[PDB]
Amino acid sequence: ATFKLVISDPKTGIAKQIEITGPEAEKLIGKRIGDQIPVKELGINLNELFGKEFPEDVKMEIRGGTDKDGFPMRPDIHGPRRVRILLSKGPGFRPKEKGERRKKTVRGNTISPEIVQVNVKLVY
Amino acid sequence: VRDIGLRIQPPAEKCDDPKCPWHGHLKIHGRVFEGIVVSDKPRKTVTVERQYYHYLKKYERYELRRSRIHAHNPPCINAKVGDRVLIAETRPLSKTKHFVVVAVLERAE
Amino acid sequence: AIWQGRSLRKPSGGRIVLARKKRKRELGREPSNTRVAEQDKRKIIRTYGGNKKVRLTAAAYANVFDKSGKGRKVRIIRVIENPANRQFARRNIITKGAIIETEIGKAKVTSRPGQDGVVNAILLEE
RNA sequence: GCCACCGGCGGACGGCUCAGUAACACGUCGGUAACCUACCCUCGGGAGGGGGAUAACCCCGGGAAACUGGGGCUAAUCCCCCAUAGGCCUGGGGUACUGGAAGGUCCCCAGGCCGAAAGGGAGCCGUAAGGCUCCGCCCGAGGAUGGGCCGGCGGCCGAUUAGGUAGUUGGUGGGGUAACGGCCCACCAAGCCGAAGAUCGGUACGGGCCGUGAGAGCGGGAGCCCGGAGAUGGACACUGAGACACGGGUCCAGGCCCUACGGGGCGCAGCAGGCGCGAAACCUCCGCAAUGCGGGAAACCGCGACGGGGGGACCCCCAGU
Ligand SMILES: [Mg+2]
Ligand SMILES: [Mg+2]
Ligand SMILES: [Mg+2]
Ligand SMILES: [Mg+2]
Ligand SMILES: [Mg+2]
Ligand SMILES: [Mg+2]
Ligand SMILES: [Zn+2]
């Protein structure tokens, strides 16, 4: 579809975002969390927005991402499906009590044409 | 001769089991009653009966009352039907046995 | 959902209608059937009041004993004639009367494994 | 000096109503040698070494809302490991203590399993070492406060309701529990209540007490105190010393509400206020000054508990025209 990538530089702790679509939104449509995709092949985006210093063999991997309505991606439920499970911690729940639980709606692991935001970081 | 806190005389034999106050590992503590046996059909258990008088207050007369309980019957003093027994109180032994026989008086008649 | 409260039937045979609900302080847990294996596993529980209970689940050694108070930690082979249950000696479930067959003879268990988390025995005579 | 966030303690008490319950639910006398217990009191002992994330804060957001994602940096009375003290089980052998009576306590051998802590914080004195005293942390023995469990006895109506029970009654060996117990299980038996009313129906929260009568008695147990039970009906678990939790969490059934139609929520038998039902029942008020509770080293802070008024031929006492 179209996505909103959140590129984050772990070596200096600043981030940027860009909007990709068309040919770009087909080469990461089926990728799972922690995949290490090369930047040059996918990325029409350039060595900018950060200061123009990166090498040429850099690549990023998938970390998380929300959904079309606003639900997070729980990196344990494999499959691009949407479920409603009872949580106690972890991505998808903010407890704010002791020993408490709740029934929150989360999304699977594989990217889909429903995901709108994708979170990535740059390993060199 | 061993006593258990009743100032009475022990039985003339020796037992086996541990649910006997005289020879085993049971402790007695509580009420101390006295009645006559009305059945010993099942194993190691009897049924003891005692009678008392209730005093009504409006009519000012009396009235005869009963009480049937169930007691463990150790193998050294095995009591039959129709004889006086002294029984004591202790912890729950089964669903409905909470007393134990300790001494037998007037066996036959 | 193993409720260990009262009964619902009087000693005379009439039924009882419960007047309250089940209190959390009356419940029970699952039988921890001890097996024979090549490595013993055990867990730890938190109990009423904050205490603990060590819970053996598989057995490897035996702690066999004697008449002069001389123990020896030796491993077990299999169970024979558990009088508790009719089909335990076959599946190798050790409860408390089990007749353990150590590698130095026979023995009789004298401890509760599911409560203490150890197996103890006396050297049964022939 | 102000503010939120990590961290500790409290929210299981207090307030409300009487639906269910003929029962060890309640009253009274006893039992636990068959049990748990944070805050608090006394005595006797310990605080020796290592390691680690992540809220606040900074850079990007997603979603209509409820809410929630990715990267960076940081600390503890936060979290985790090692050692030692200690806790638990079983075998063998001594006789030191309590008690009416030791499956308990104490001492000596042996085989195993579990396994602690924050020398942390604030004032002062001396150049500094370093003290002085205030609030603290962990283990053991005992109490106290609060309960769980178990007996003996005592209190309604019905025969146009006579037989009832099959884990039902008991024994042997076990599991489970904080703990005894057919409380559950595997085998062996045939017991157990009953015309002195069992079983099944009916109605009902129990007592201290209250109305009436010269008394014997007959009738009632809304309001105050003490016990029990419930949070729209039925099932079930997490955290904790304690709950299967009225203002905490799931599932079903039955109602209602917001929505950008994809998804979210709520349940006054707390205090005022509203609708419905009925012959039948009040202000959407002011305060933490008093009695007390939770927190804090303390001064203090919060409390529809409690305290002050507003409405009404509620019951008593003392007067006017
Ligand atoms: Mg409450
Ligand atoms: Mg009835
Ligand atoms: Mg973060
Ligand atoms: Mg038994
Ligand atoms: Mg009723
Ligand atoms: Mg009126
Ligand atoms: Zn005897």
PDB file of all heavy atoms in Angstrom, chain D residues 54-55 57 71-73, ligand 3:
ATOM      1  P     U D  54      17.183  -1.014  28.873  1.00  0.00           P
ATOM      2  OP1   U D  54      17.214  -1.356  27.443  1.00  0.00           O
ATOM      3  OP2   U D  54      18.255  -0.167  29.442  1.00  0.00           O
ATOM      4  O5'   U D  54      15.784  -0.322  29.144  1.00  0.00           O
ATOM      5  C5'   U D  54      14.623  -1.101  29.375  1.00  0.00           C
ATOM      6  C4'   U D  54      13.706  -0.432  30.365  1.00  0.00           C
ATOM      7  O4'   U D  54      14.174  -0.667  31.712  1.00  0.00           O
ATOM      8  C3'   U D  54      13.616   1.078  30.268  1.00  0.00           C
ATOM      9  O3'   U D  54      12.736   1.494  29.243  1.00  0.00           O
ATOM     10  C2'   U D  54      13.162   1.473  31.662  1.00  0.00           C
ATOM     11  O2'   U D  54      11.771   1.266  31.801  1.00  0.00           O
ATOM     12  C1'   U D  54      13.884   0.443  32.523  1.00  0.00           C
ATOM     13  N1    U D  54      15.150   0.959  33.074  1.00  0.00           N
ATOM     14  C2    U D  54      15.110   1.548  34.302  1.00  0.00           C
ATOM     15  O2    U D  54      14.088   1.668  34.927  1.00  0.00           O
ATOM     16  N3    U D  54      16.303   2.000  34.768  1.00  0.00           N
ATOM     17  C4    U D  54      17.514   1.918  34.138  1.00  0.00           C
ATOM     18  O4    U D  54      18.511   2.372  34.678  1.00  0.00           O
ATOM     19  C5    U D  54      17.484   1.283  32.876  1.00  0.00           C
ATOM     20  C6    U D  54      16.327   0.836  32.398  1.00  0.00           C
ATOM     21  P     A D  55      12.337   3.036  29.081  1.00  0.00           P
ATOM     22  OP1   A D  55      11.876   3.272  27.697  1.00  0.00           O
ATOM     23  OP2   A D  55      13.422   3.879  29.613  1.00  0.00           O
ATOM     24  O5'   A D  55      11.102   3.201  30.057  1.00  0.00           O
ATOM     25  C5'   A D  55      10.612   4.489  30.358  1.00  0.00           C
ATOM     26  C4'   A D  55       9.733   4.498  31.576  1.00  0.00           C
ATOM     27  O4'   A D  55      10.448   3.961  32.715  1.00  0.00           O
ATOM     28  C3'   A D  55       9.299   5.877  32.021  1.00  0.00           C
ATOM     29  O3'   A D  55       8.177   6.327  31.294  1.00  0.00           O
ATOM     30  C2'   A D  55       9.031   5.683  33.500  1.00  0.00           C
ATOM     31  O2'   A D  55       7.775   5.062  33.697  1.00  0.00           O
ATOM     32  C1'   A D  55      10.125   4.688  33.874  1.00  0.00           C
ATOM     33  N9    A D  55      11.355   5.353  34.339  1.00  0.00           N
ATOM     34  C8    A D  55      12.612   5.077  33.902  1.00  0.00           C
ATOM     35  N7    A D  55      13.544   5.793  34.453  1.00  0.00           N
ATOM     36  C5    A D  55      12.861   6.599  35.332  1.00  0.00           C
ATOM     37  C6    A D  55      13.295   7.587  36.223  1.00  0.00           C
ATOM     38  N6    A D  55      14.562   7.951  36.389  1.00  0.00           N
ATOM     39  N1    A D  55      12.366   8.209  36.957  1.00  0.00           N
ATOM     40  C2    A D  55      11.093   7.856  36.800  1.00  0.00           C
ATOM     41  N3    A D  55      10.562   6.947  35.998  1.00  0.00           N
ATOM     42  C4    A D  55      11.512   6.340  35.278  1.00  0.00           C
ATOM     43  P     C D  57       8.793  13.776  31.300  1.00  0.00           P
ATOM     44  OP1   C D  57       8.161  15.077  31.580  1.00  0.00           O
ATOM     45  OP2   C D  57       8.093  12.845  30.403  1.00  0.00           O
ATOM     46  O5'   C D  57      10.237  14.081  30.719  1.00  0.00           O
ATOM     47  C5'   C D  57      11.079  15.033  31.349  1.00  0.00           C
ATOM     48  C4'   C D  57      12.488  14.951  30.828  1.00  0.00           C
ATOM     49  O4'   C D  57      13.078  13.681  31.199  1.00  0.00           O
ATOM     50  C3'   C D  57      12.639  14.987  29.318  1.00  0.00           C
ATOM     51  O3'   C D  57      12.569  16.289  28.781  1.00  0.00           O
ATOM     52  C2'   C D  57      13.993  14.336  29.123  1.00  0.00           C
ATOM     53  O2'   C D  57      15.022  15.237  29.499  1.00  0.00           O
ATOM     54  C1'   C D  57      13.941  13.236  30.174  1.00  0.00           C
ATOM     55  N1    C D  57      13.431  11.953  29.635  1.00  0.00           N
ATOM     56  C2    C D  57      14.184  11.227  28.723  1.00  0.00           C
ATOM     57  O2    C D  57      15.265  11.686  28.352  1.00  0.00           O
ATOM     58  N3    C D  57      13.715  10.054  28.254  1.00  0.00           N
ATOM     59  C4    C D  57      12.543   9.594  28.667  1.00  0.00           C
ATOM     60  N4    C D  57      12.107   8.433  28.185  1.00  0.00           N
ATOM     61  C5    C D  57      11.762  10.303  29.597  1.00  0.00           C
ATOM     62  C6    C D  57      12.244  11.456  30.045  1.00  0.00           C
ATOM     63  P     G D  71      13.363  -0.765  19.851  1.00  0.00           P
ATOM     64  OP1   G D  71      14.288  -1.887  19.607  1.00  0.00           O
ATOM     65  OP2   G D  71      12.624  -0.701  21.123  1.00  0.00           O
ATOM     66  O5'   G D  71      14.213   0.561  19.657  1.00  0.00           O
ATOM     67  C5'   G D  71      15.271   0.581  18.716  1.00  0.00           C
ATOM     68  C4'   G D  71      15.891   1.945  18.552  1.00  0.00           C
ATOM     69  O4'   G D  71      14.865   2.947  18.362  1.00  0.00           O
ATOM     70  C3'   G D  71      16.685   2.479  19.721  1.00  0.00           C
ATOM     71  O3'   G D  71      17.966   1.898  19.848  1.00  0.00           O
ATOM     72  C2'   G D  71      16.725   3.961  19.415  1.00  0.00           C
ATOM     73  O2'   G D  71      17.645   4.206  18.371  1.00  0.00           O
ATOM     74  C1'   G D  71      15.323   4.186  18.857  1.00  0.00           C
ATOM     75  N9    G D  71      14.378   4.682  19.877  1.00  0.00           N
ATOM     76  C8    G D  71      13.251   4.040  20.296  1.00  0.00           C
ATOM     77  N7    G D  71      12.585   4.700  21.198  1.00  0.00           N
ATOM     78  C5    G D  71      13.323   5.847  21.401  1.00  0.00           C
ATOM     79  C6    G D  71      13.090   6.934  22.276  1.00  0.00           C
ATOM     80  O6    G D  71      12.158   7.099  23.065  1.00  0.00           O
ATOM     81  N1    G D  71      14.074   7.904  22.176  1.00  0.00           N
ATOM     82  C2    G D  71      15.149   7.833  21.335  1.00  0.00           C
ATOM     83  N2    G D  71      15.999   8.866  21.377  1.00  0.00           N
ATOM     84  N3    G D  71      15.378   6.819  20.515  1.00  0.00           N
ATOM     85  C4    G D  71      14.432   5.860  20.591  1.00  0.00           C
ATOM     86  P     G D  72      18.634   1.772  21.302  1.00  0.00           P
ATOM     87  OP1   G D  72      19.952   1.121  21.185  1.00  0.00           O
ATOM     88  OP2   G D  72      17.621   1.208  22.221  1.00  0.00           O
ATOM     89  O5'   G D  72      18.935   3.272  21.728  1.00  0.00           O
ATOM     90  C5'   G D  72      20.068   3.952  21.221  1.00  0.00           C
ATOM     91  C4'   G D  72      20.190   5.336  21.793  1.00  0.00           C
ATOM     92  O4'   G D  72      18.908   5.994  21.781  1.00  0.00           O
ATOM     93  C3'   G D  72      20.624   5.427  23.239  1.00  0.00           C
ATOM     94  O3'   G D  72      22.020   5.285  23.388  1.00  0.00           O
ATOM     95  C2'   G D  72      20.120   6.800  23.652  1.00  0.00           C
ATOM     96  O2'   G D  72      21.007   7.804  23.191  1.00  0.00           O
ATOM     97  C1'   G D  72      18.836   6.917  22.842  1.00  0.00           C
ATOM     98  N9    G D  72      17.595   6.688  23.606  1.00  0.00           N
ATOM     99  C8    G D  72      16.747   5.635  23.416  1.00  0.00           C
ATOM    100  N7    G D  72      15.688   5.672  24.163  1.00  0.00           N
ATOM    101  C5    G D  72      15.827   6.835  24.889  1.00  0.00           C
ATOM    102  C6    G D  72      14.969   7.395  25.865  1.00  0.00           C
ATOM    103  O6    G D  72      13.897   6.952  26.284  1.00  0.00           O
ATOM    104  N1    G D  72      15.461   8.587  26.365  1.00  0.00           N
ATOM    105  C2    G D  72      16.628   9.170  25.968  1.00  0.00           C
ATOM    106  N2    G D  72      16.943  10.323  26.561  1.00  0.00           N
ATOM    107  N3    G D  72      17.439   8.654  25.057  1.00  0.00           N
ATOM    108  C4    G D  72      16.986   7.489  24.553  1.00  0.00           C
ATOM    109  P     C D  73      22.622   4.634  24.717  1.00  0.00           P
ATOM    110  OP1   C D  73      24.094   4.600  24.602  1.00  0.00           O
ATOM    111  OP2   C D  73      21.874   3.393  24.995  1.00  0.00           O
ATOM    112  O5'   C D  73      22.243   5.678  25.850  1.00  0.00           O
ATOM    113  C5'   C D  73      23.018   6.847  26.059  1.00  0.00           C
ATOM    114  C4'   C D  73      22.552   7.602  27.278  1.00  0.00           C
ATOM    115  O4'   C D  73      21.193   8.057  27.065  1.00  0.00           O
ATOM    116  C3'   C D  73      22.469   6.805  28.568  1.00  0.00           C
ATOM    117  O3'   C D  73      23.702   6.668  29.236  1.00  0.00           O
ATOM    118  C2'   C D  73      21.447   7.590  29.368  1.00  0.00           C
ATOM    119  O2'   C D  73      22.040   8.768  29.883  1.00  0.00           O
ATOM    120  C1'   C D  73      20.474   8.002  28.276  1.00  0.00           C
ATOM    121  N1    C D  73      19.351   7.054  28.115  1.00  0.00           N
ATOM    122  C2    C D  73      18.147   7.424  28.669  1.00  0.00           C
ATOM    123  O2    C D  73      18.113   8.498  29.267  1.00  0.00           O
ATOM    124  N3    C D  73      17.069   6.636  28.539  1.00  0.00           N
ATOM    125  C4    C D  73      17.173   5.493  27.882  1.00  0.00           C
ATOM    126  N4    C D  73      16.092   4.734  27.780  1.00  0.00           N
ATOM    127  C5    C D  73      18.394   5.079  27.297  1.00  0.00           C
ATOM    128  C6    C D  73      19.447   5.885  27.434  1.00  0.00           C
TER     129        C D  73
HETATM  130 MG    MG E   3      11.882   3.130  25.581  1.00  0.00          MG
END
